A = this chain, B = another copy of it.
Amino acid sequence: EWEALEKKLAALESKXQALEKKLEALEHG
């Protein structure tokens, strides 16, 4: 259960980064 949560947090961190970069693109057109 704990390790599963950690893997989910890892996934979210990646999505985290993905959205940050996309918003940076959209900000600039």
Binding site for B on A (CB under 8 A): 1-2, 5-6, 8-9, 12-13, 15-16, 19-20, 22-23, 26-27
Contacts and interface: CB of A to CB of B under 8 A. Distances in A.
Contact of A20 (B2, B6, B15): B15
Tell me what chain A mostly uses at the interface: helix, strand, loop, or mixed: helix
A26 B25 CA distance: 11
B6 A9 contact: no
Nearest to A15: B16
A13 B11 CA distance: 10
Contacts of A15: 16, 20
Contact of A8 (B9, B20, B27): B9
A20 to B, nearest CB: 6
